[PDB]
Amino acid sequence: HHNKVRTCWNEGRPALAGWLQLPGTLHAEALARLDYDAVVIDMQHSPIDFGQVAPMLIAIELGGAEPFVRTQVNDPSDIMKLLDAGAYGIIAPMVNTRAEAQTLASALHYSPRGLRSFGPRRPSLRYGSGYLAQASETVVGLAMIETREALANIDEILSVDGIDGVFIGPTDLALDLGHAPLVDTEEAEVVSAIAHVRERAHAAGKRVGIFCGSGGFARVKLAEGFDFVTAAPDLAMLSAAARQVIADARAL
Amino acid sequence: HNKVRTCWNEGRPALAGWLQLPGTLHAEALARLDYDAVVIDMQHSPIDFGQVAPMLIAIELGGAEPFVRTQVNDPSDIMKLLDAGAYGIIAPMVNTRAEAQTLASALHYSPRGLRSFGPRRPSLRYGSGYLAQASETVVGLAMIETREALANIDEILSVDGIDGVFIGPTDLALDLGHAPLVDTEEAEVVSAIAHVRERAHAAGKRVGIFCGSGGFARVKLAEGFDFVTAAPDLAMLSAAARQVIADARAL
Ligand SMILES: [Br-]
Ligand SMILES: [K+]
Ligand SMILES: [K+]
Ligand SMILES: [K+]
Ligand SMILES: [Mn+2]
Ligand SMILES: [Mn+2]
Ligand SMILES: [Mn+2]
């Protein structure tokens, strides 16, 4: 009866999360059983719809990691249905202003703190009778920062009480800032932008996460003091594994 | 043409992928790599018929030959998969001549076999001239994974209508009384594997093998295996994730 990422935080440690773009329950469970604190299901840059995400949330919870979802859009009703289906973390794209951050916050809390609609099918089963007492704590919410405008409005975004923090998408930020969308970009303007966001978030007493294409990049970000680090998409890890298997098999 | 049969016709073996995770995106992604075929496992996986059908499309688009390892050597199940554009069949637990003939039956139209005619997806690939070339378009391998199959290898290899045999080394090791470890070094198992290969080659038939690693597969290819699989998606993904976590946590 605790959110595994909040459990990390409450002991002053970061969380490490997986990242799924392939639908299905078997790899979800299997990866959740690894040394991940959470597994994010990507519903934006994937073919995963609601019908496919629902059983995946169950698998992840059984494997023993906190089920997260990066949604397709910052839409309150979408987020509500996922929370009611047992998503216990939400990463919302394209949060560029304070109003949009407030929109995210509105979906995560019941009245009076937000406007979340009441019908917690799966959380009521996990947390039982004492759910509603602690409902806000059970969920982690992060606003994605991935545009020049978000960067400009970082302080007003972090002013919003009902979100835990922000989540950096480095590749989308590189592309928005006029650069190539490299995996794990180290383009200097982007490195500076990210460093800045991390500072402002910590200064405001908020959490800061970041998407990572690799183990090596995650290690750096963890060393830099990021609170929530994802590494690495299941599809990318599998393709690179298969390429290496083939190279080894066809070698002289 | 069937890409695996093309390999064989040009004197070279085939390397194949191996899928136990349902879905089309990784099926297409892995098919675009330097695999000649990708096998969809329908036995030791949650992949049902509804899930396999779009995956065969995805593999074909990516440009490998879609193969299936069926749940069972059942003719009507195989016929429905061929009709859905499985162009390779690996049937488990083929232990006798009789069972190998049952496999053959499913792969060829009368008078050579008793395949029912209704080739939804192959007729789209091959057009109106499909029937005259249908047998060629499909590859059929009988699995050798028991002591019984080992004993009856020559009688199994005698059957017209199958291209050869596919060794299931973990099941074979288990049935021989050893641990079901992939890419095993256990001497009795290694010897049985070499024996089946020798018998198949002497009978002018093809031999495949399931591999857990590229390093093992390189050896199998060097030994003359016609059809080498390496390595299951779930196994590879799991090892990749474990290494990423170790690298991130500086373990
Ligand atoms: Br394996
Ligand atoms: K659906
Ligand atoms: K875990
Ligand atoms: K290919
Ligand atoms: Mn984006
Ligand atoms: Mn087997
Ligand atoms: Mn078996």
Numbering used by the authors:
A (entry chain B): 0 to 251
B (entry chain A): 1 to 251
Published text:
SwHKA displays activity both with Mn2+ and Mg2+. In the absence of substrates, M2+ R constitutes the predominant state and the M2+ A,W complex was observed with lower occupancy in crystal structures of holo‐SwHKA. Conversely, a square pyramidal coordination sphere at 2.4 Å distance from M2+ R constitutes the catalytically active state of holo‐SwHKA. Here, the coordination sphere no longer includes residue S116′, but only consists of E145, D171 next to three water molecules (M2+ A). The square‐pyramidal M2+ A,W complex was unanimously predicted for both Mg2+ and high‐spin Mn2+ in SwHKA to be lower in energy than the corresponding hypothetical octahedral M2+ A,W complex with four water ligands. Thermodynamics, therefore, favor a square‐pyramidal coordination geometry for M2+ A,W, which promotes substrate binding by providing a free coordination site. The energy difference between M2+ R and M2+ A,W in SwHKA therefore, seems to be substantially larger for protein‐metal complexes with Mg2+ than with Mn2+.
Here structural analysis of hydroxyketoacid aldolase from Sphingomonas wittichii RW1 (SwHKA) revealed a dynamic movement of the metal cofactor between two coordination spheres without protein scaffold rearrangements. Holo‐SwHKA forms a trimer of homodimers, in which each monomer adopts an (α/β)8 triosephosphate isomerase (TIM) barrel fold. In total, holo‐SwHKA contains six equivalent active sites; each of which is formed from amino acids from two different domain‐swapped dimers.
